[PDB]
Amino acid sequence: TKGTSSFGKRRNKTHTLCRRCGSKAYHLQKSTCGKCGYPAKRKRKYNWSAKAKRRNTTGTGRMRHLKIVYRRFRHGFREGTTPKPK
Amino acid sequence: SSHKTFRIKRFLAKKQKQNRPIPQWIWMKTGNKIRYNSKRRHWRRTKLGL
Amino acid sequence: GAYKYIQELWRKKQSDVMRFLLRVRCWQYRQLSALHRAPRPTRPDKARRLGYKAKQGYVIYRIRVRRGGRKRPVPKGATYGKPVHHGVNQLKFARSLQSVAEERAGRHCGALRVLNSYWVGEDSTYKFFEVILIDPFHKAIRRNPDTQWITKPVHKHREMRGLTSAGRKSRGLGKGHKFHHTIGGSRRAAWRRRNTLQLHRYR
Amino acid sequence: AKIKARDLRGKKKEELLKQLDDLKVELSQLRVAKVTGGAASKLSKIRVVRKSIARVLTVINQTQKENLRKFYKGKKYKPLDLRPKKTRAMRRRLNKHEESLKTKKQQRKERLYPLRKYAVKA
Amino acid sequence: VKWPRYIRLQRQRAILYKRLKVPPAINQFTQVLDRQTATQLLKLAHKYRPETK
Amino acid sequence: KIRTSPTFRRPKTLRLRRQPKYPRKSAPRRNKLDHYAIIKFPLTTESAMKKIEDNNTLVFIVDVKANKHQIKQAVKKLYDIDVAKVNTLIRPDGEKKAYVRLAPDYDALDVANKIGII
RNA sequence: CGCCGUUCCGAAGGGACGGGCGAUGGCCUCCGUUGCCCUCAGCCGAUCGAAAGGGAGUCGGGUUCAGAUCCCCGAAUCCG
RNA sequence: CGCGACCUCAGAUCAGACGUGGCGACCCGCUGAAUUUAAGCAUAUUAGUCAGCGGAGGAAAAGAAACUAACCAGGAUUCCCUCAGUAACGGCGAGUGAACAGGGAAGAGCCCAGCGCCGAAUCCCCGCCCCGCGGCGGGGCGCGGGAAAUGUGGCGUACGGA
Ligand SMILES: [Mg+2]
Ligand SMILES: [Mg+2]
Ligand SMILES: [Mg+2]
Ligand SMILES: [Mg+2]
Ligand SMILES: [Mg+2]
Ligand SMILES: [Mg+2]
Ligand SMILES: [Mg+2]
Ligand SMILES: [Mg+2]
Ligand SMILES: [Mg+2]
Ligand SMILES: [Mg+2]
Ligand SMILES: [Mg+2]
Ligand SMILES: [Mg+2]
Ligand SMILES: [Mg+2]
Ligand SMILES: [Mg+2]
Ligand SMILES: [Mg+2]
Ligand SMILES: [Mg+2]
Ligand SMILES: [Mg+2]
Ligand SMILES: [Mg+2]
Ligand SMILES: [Mg+2]
Ligand SMILES: [Mg+2]
Ligand SMILES: [Mg+2]
Ligand SMILES: [Mg+2]
Ligand SMILES: [Mg+2]
Ligand SMILES: [Mg+2]
Ligand SMILES: [Mg+2]
Ligand SMILES: [Mg+2]
Ligand SMILES: [Mg+2]
Ligand SMILES: [Mg+2]
Ligand SMILES: [Zn+2]
């Protein structure tokens, strides 16, 4: 009865959504993420999975602030000035 | 279930709004290729997983 | 010229005077925590010839490191390999205990820069070292041209990259025929150079 | 009667707050119109009124920051948001004065032994 | 009283200096002037204090 | 002078209040949940009309972050009416619906005409 | 990287009736508030851990296409 | 008993600062296999390599001899050519394996502690005036506070120095 019959007894969730990486790998009883390692301060990451590192590296997301830096670097991070008014 | 967390009830709401057909004026757009919403989901065929 | 007498005095470590001081100080150091901010250098002459200056921004920390070698951290002593790698005891760590002492002071005070360290005592179980650190943002340091070098980002965590005097001794650096391993600046640098195939365009 | 930022530059704060409130009242009415069958003209007005709201808030925020900078010009300590952003690493650099500093031993060396201009006969 | 660790430490260090054998080089400093000589010595020295800032 | 207790406790020491040389934020942040933000638009469905006519109740879509006290104060200020109570639910699509009941001296059917709902 | 450990190598209390000194106030009369001092003080373990355990207090009638011990009508109750 | 110095040690939402996390192609410090080859296999090899941990920067590390040599001598570090699959290591098996000299790329040298002499000649911070102020600094004035003789600053460092 280890097959079809035993598949009907599973109605208790092991993982839920992680508040750091948003992946359903937050083990509830261990209070840890199998994906990002939350609540550890440092992000979980290994070199034996290159594919996994390119799934969530820098660039794969929004780059909300890093992509304005790339624009600001091309002008020397000038601040407190404006183009000559009309 | 009836017993729900706010976070789950909010995730489910977003999955509800994405489950609609494309507007029909999207077809006439100049460089359009989309024919239909290829990301449709059915509660019975495929499960949200959470 | 008192710093001359003290230096000579701290060379007679088996004299009755210094044996008494080392013994009670080791006892006192043993009743404190493994990391402890020291109000002033226990060895003012030794500290200063290692770079310490008695001005604001220089701080002293006493670090206690357990003595002895490195036991391999394998469960039940099983290494799962060939007999050449079965060793569990009698293995030694590549770096000194003084270097470990600086690393533990550098990690704790991450906003400071580790300058150097020195030996202040030991018993069968512990060695005691005092680490000289610098606050790289105190204006007594930033405005002094002769100490501006250590406020540079290139000098973050010297103790963690083998750049301190105690740290760099385990890197096998040095000039001459005894140190061919590190020609190129480091063992890895020498290895890469000696193990890279140069395939010139015209070969 | 469209709202242009240039027209708003010199006005008083309370005068712009009043102007803001009129637009916000207008938008709410349009949002009621959006569901009661307002004409296409009223629907198109929503985006026009929304960006007019943004323009007023922009001029209020800009004018307020301009005066805060004038307020804190001579002050030694300024709010973190009025200090230069640059990058985090650039904010931690030795400033202009600190990099120019030299020990008196180095100043005397440069004075006595300045690099010379010379040529060698062919 | 159960004193803080730092109090226990400095008191137990004063007991050790009595309990152990202190070499004469360190023990010579326990012999000091009496108050009357130190007062005279300090009053004369008071007349040659370095000028303040 | 004497210790009647074998315990030693950390003595209480003066704790000064903060006196910053500068404020970390130059200006206070503007309120982003004002009255016009709380009330998005009125609901005009068949059941909303029944609420207006039979239960003296207006039906609004409101910001999910708003609470009953905020909704009540926003409704009064925006439309200058009095509110008896507020009932709230969060809809399956994420929007928050507010069932606002007006005081007996107010006619929701009349108030709806002022708002433009009817 | 961290791990062990949960009262065990810890100066682990930011509290209180009352009293004393000032500073302020208001239905300025006399009462509040506040700061300091005096005095008194075990709990001895941060925190998390149950939609079946502990845990104050809502019942009747009507009402929808789909909700009601939640809406309306009526009659109550606990807590602050 | 009290008062006052210092020392050692605490508590503050005290004033002002700073560290954390990421990326990680290249770089530095550790730790570190076994497939594999040896026609078996245990030393060896794989390999100081993969995996694992830490720390950076635009480069890093190294670097101005406790050097190479043994010549009529060279002269910091790094890189290229060659030395050289060489001296050497190795069940002396399989395999492994540099350096010096020579030719180029580049080229740059310096500073403390110490020993001494200078009235601490030194440094940080607060207040006020002038300047400048999106790299918070310069000048002036405070019987303003502190650090510092348990040693700051100037001269000076093996090429000798005063
Ligand atoms: Mg489980
Ligand atoms: Mg199913
Ligand atoms: Mg090693
Ligand atoms: Mg060297
Ligand atoms: Mg000098
Ligand atoms: Mg709980
Ligand atoms: Mg419960
Ligand atoms: Mg229960
Ligand atoms: Mg009721
Ligand atoms: Mg503070
Ligand atoms: Mg084989
Ligand atoms: Mg074979
Ligand atoms: Mg085999
Ligand atoms: Mg082997
Ligand atoms: Mg090897
Ligand atoms: Mg690796
Ligand atoms: Mg790492
Ligand atoms: Mg880092
Ligand atoms: Mg960088
Ligand atoms: Mg460097
Ligand atoms: Mg060279
Ligand atoms: Mg040949
Ligand atoms: Mg053989
Ligand atoms: Mg090898
Ligand atoms: Mg050569
Ligand atoms: Mg050249
Ligand atoms: Mg000197
Ligand atoms: Mg030399
Ligand atoms: Zn996660």
Which ranges constitute the DSSP H helices of D1-122?
13-36, 40-71, 88-91, 96-100, 104-112
Instruction: Name the experimental technique.
Output: cryo-EM
DSSP string of chain C, one letter each residue: -HHHHHHHHTT-TTSHHHHHHHHHHHHHHHTS-SEEEESS-SSHHHHHHTT--SSTTEEEEEEEEE-S------GGG---S-GGG---SS---SS-HHHHHHHHHHHHSTTSEEEEEEEEEE-SSEEEEEEEEE-TTSHHHHT-GGGGGGGSGGGTTGGGTT-SHHHHGGGT--SSTT-GGGTTSSHHHHHHHHH-----S--
How far is Cα of residue C158 from the mean position of the Cα atoms in its chain? 10
Q: Which nucleotide is nearest to B8 (CA to C1')?
A: G51
Are the Cβ atoms of B12 and F90 closer than 8 angstroms? no
Look at phi and psi of residue A59 and say left if phi exceeds 0, alpha if psi is from -120 to 50, else beta.
left
A36 annotated to a ligand binding site? yes
- With beta carbons less than 8 A apart as the criterion, state whether F54 and F109 touch: no
Q: Which ligand is nearest to the CA of F85?
A: 9
C162: left (phi over 0), alpha (psi -120 to 50) or beta: left
Q: Which ligand minimizes its atom distance to the CA of D87?
A: 19
Quick check: F8 and F36 in contact, CB under 8 A? no
| C86 Cβ within 7 A of any nucleic strand H atom | no
- Give the number of beta-carbon pairs within 8 Å between A and D: 9
What are the backbone angles phi and psi of residue C14, rounded to the nearest 5°?
-105, 10
CA of E6 to C1' of H9 (A): 6
C-alpha closest to that of D13 among D66, D52, D49: D66
Cis peptide before C41 (omega within 30 of 0): no
User: Would the CB atoms of D101 and C153 count as touching at under 8 Å?
Assistant: no
What distance in Å separates the CA atoms of residue B48 and residue B11, rounded to the nearest whole number?
10
Q: Which nucleotide is nearest to A81 (CA to C1')?
A: H134
Q: Contact at 8 Å (CB) between F43 and F61?
A: yes
Is A45 annotated as belonging to a binding site?
no
Contact present, C181 and C190 (Cβ < 8 Å):
yes
In this structure, are residues F74 and F66 in contact, taking their beta carbons and an 8 Å threshold? Answer: yes
What are the angstrom distances between the C-alpha of F47 and each of A28, C35, C165, D5?
Answer: 42, 71, 81, 44
Neighbouring-strand partners of residue C169? none
Contact (Cβ atoms closer than 8 angstroms) between residue C159 and residue C99: yes
CA–CA distance, C108 with C117 (Å, rounded to integer): 15
- Contact of chains C and E by CB distance (3 or more pairs under 8 angstroms): yes
Is A18 labeled as ligand-binding? yes
**Cα separation, D10 vs D13, whole angstroms:** 9
Report which of residues 145-174 in chain C place their beta carbon less than 7 angstroms from any atom of strand H: 146, 153-157, 160-163, 167-168, 170-171, 173-174
The answer to whether C91 touches C72, Cβ cutoff 8 Å, is: yes
> Phi and psi for C180 in degrees, rounded to 5?
-70, -15
Q: List, in sequence order, the alpha helices (H) in D37-95.
A: 40-71, 88-91
Which helix (H) or strand (E) segment is F7 a member of?
A: none
- Full DSSP string of A28-68: TTTTEETTT-TTSSSPP--TT-HHHHHHSSTTSS--TTHHH
Side-chain half-sphere CA neighbours of C128 within 13 A: 26
Q: For H154, which residue's CA is nearest its C1'?
A: D104
* Partners of D11 in the β-ladder: none
DSSP string, F89-117: EE-TTSPEEEEEEEPTTS-HHHHHHHHT-
The tokens describing D101, both together, are 């500093």
Tokens of D100: 């120019």
Cβ atoms of residues F82 and F105 within 8 Å: yes
Count how many pairs of residues, chain D against chain F, have C-beta atoms within 8 Å.
47
Distance CA E3, CA F5 (A): 11
Contact C43, C18 (CB under 8 A): no
Output the CA C69–ligand 24 centroid distance in Å: 26
**With contact defined as beta carbons under 8 Å apart, do C152 and C105 qualify?**
no
Cα–Cα distance measured from residue C6 to residue C8, given in angstroms and rounded to the nearest whole number: 5
Q: What is the CA radius of gyration of chain D?
A: 29
Distances (CA, A) of E41 to A21, A75, C125, E34, E52: 75, 72, 48, 10, 21
Q: What span, in angstroms and rounded, lies between the C-alpha atoms of F36 and D28?
A: 7
Say yes or no: Cβ of C12 under 7 A from any atom of strand H.
no
The C1' atom of H65 and the CA atom of C90 lie apart, in whole Å, by: 36
Q: Is D69 helix (H, G, I), strand (E, B) or coil?
A: helix
Residues from chain F that touch B12, judged by Cβ atoms under 8 A, are 92
Question: Residue F84: enclosing H or E segment and its boundaries?
Answer: strand F83-90
Q: Which positions in chain F touch B13 (Cβ < 8 Å)?
A: 91-94
Strand G: which positions are within 7 A of a protein CB? 1-2, 9-15, 36-37, 44, 51, 64-66, 70-72
Output DSSP code: residue A11: -
Nearest to D32 by CA among E1, F118, C41: F118
Chain E residues within 8 A of C16 when measuring between CB atoms:
23, 25
Which nucleotide comes closest to F16 if you measure CA to C1'? H14
Asked whether the beta carbons of C93 and C70 are under 8 A apart, the reply is yes
CB contact at 8 A, C94 and C165 = no
CA distances (Å), origin A8, targets A16, B3, C30, D73: 20, 22, 61, 72
Whether any strand H atom is under 7 angstroms from the Cβ of C121: the reply reads no
Name every chain B residue with its beta carbon within 8 A of the beta carbon of A24.
Answer: 49-50
Q: Which secondary-structure segment (H or E) carries D5?
A: none
- Pull the structure tokens for residue F10: 């950390």
Resolution (A): 2.8
C96: exposed, middle or buried (Cβ count in 10 Å: 0-12, 13-18, 19+): middle
CB contact, 8 Å: C179 with chain E?
no
Which residues in chain A are contacts of B49 at CB distance < 8 A? 24
